[PDB]
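Q: I'm writing a short explainer about Cytochrome P450 monooxygenase for a general audience and would like to include a description of its predicted shape. Could you first generate the structure from this sequence?
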Amino acid sequence: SPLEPYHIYPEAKSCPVAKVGLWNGTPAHVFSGYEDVRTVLQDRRFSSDSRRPNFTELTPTLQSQAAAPPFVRTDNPDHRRLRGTIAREFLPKHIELLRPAIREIVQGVLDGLAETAPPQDMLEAFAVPVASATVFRLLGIPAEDRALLTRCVKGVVSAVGSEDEGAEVFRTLGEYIGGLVQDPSELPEDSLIRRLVTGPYQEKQLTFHETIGVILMLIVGGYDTTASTISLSLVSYALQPEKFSVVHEHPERIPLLVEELLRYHTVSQLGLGRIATEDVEVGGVTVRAGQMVVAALPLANRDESVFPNPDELDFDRPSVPHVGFGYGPHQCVGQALARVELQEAIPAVIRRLPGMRLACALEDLPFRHDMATYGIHELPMTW
Ligand code: HEM
Ligand SMILES: CN1C(=O)[C@](O)(Cc2ccccc2)N(C)C(=O)[C@@H]1Cc1c[nH]c2cccc([N+](=O)[O-])c12
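A: Of course. Here's the predicted structure. Afterward I'll give you a sentence or two in plain language.
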């Protein structure tokens, strides 16, 4: 069943706190309860510092960066400092100002397809163009460089690439970003990368390589999950288009509809790894100092004690906040941007192409079982 997340940590079907083996055999406790997952993610005893002995990334590719990771794998003081360099960019009030530009990106992509015959791969023809243009323009990345970055991101997010293969993709990506930090003069004045490089970095608030790290995370984080969420949401539309009547009849409920999609399609499918810094009791288990845990976001998001009939996509749910963007100090810095993109893209394409249906059988879609984040590798649609 590809629209349910239960195949990832099958041990969790039996225990809300399940002992499992990670990619390299390292033991971990997987927490699948909503309240437990929030507890873990907000507790200072569960570290994100990949420099700690035994810290295990959930893929080998990411393991390659554990000795010098970007800020997602730090605790304070570095975490606060490094996130602080770009935090202001991502405040909802600032991101809201980009809504008109985002709406025009969406419109332009749809206009581009207006005379194109189906079937179309809506990942490559819609979701990726929207999401990648949105972030790459925010960042200031030259149009000519975007294909390379796209290839690098795929490598970074692979759950099948080896640790050595991962090290190589990160080198390529890091060398590219480094060139921009050294010489940002061709980048637009109104760009996040130029502001970072001529602001905090010029003011010596973080190093050259830390600057690379911050930019790297925004490229890796900045469109792939958004594009995948758009795509999965279009699978949901194709299967049950009547549920999306909200888009037409009650447009004020679109933000809520987007939240339910983020709950249902928790694309951070492996959950979030943490390491205990001391012995900690949570959810009736004692996690020992130096041992790994996983906060299983997709499962927390289908905890029936919080979300009744959790396997149903239901846009009339009582509103409870999901944990699709994580929780606590690392909670997705990009979440406001993702939300604006989803709110603008999904309704627009449904309005333009309300007859959208899968062009192939659901079982023939290539789901992203081989990536750190879920979605589909291609989404053939007809109308
Ligand atoms: C639907 C879209 C997205 C999902 C589901 C998503 C999910 C996540 C999650 C679960 C985390 C927390 C990781 C942890 O605690 O270890 C995170 C962190 C992050 N997200 Fe996102 N994200 C999305 C969109 C974006 C976008 C659009 C950007 C940037 C433009 C971005 C940038 C980041 C960054 C930099 C972090 C690191 C934050 C930190 O460690 O303090 N994300 N995201
Ligand atoms: C790949 N990825 C993910 O897609 C993500 O699902 C979402 C995300 C993306 C970017 C930033 C934050 C969150 N989550 C939850 C992740 O933890 C890792 C990030 C990561 C983890 N360890 C890393 C080491 C080096 C570089 C990166 N990187 O982001 O470039 C990482």
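A: For your explainer, you could say: The longest helix spans residues 163-182.
Q: Perfect, that's easy to follow.
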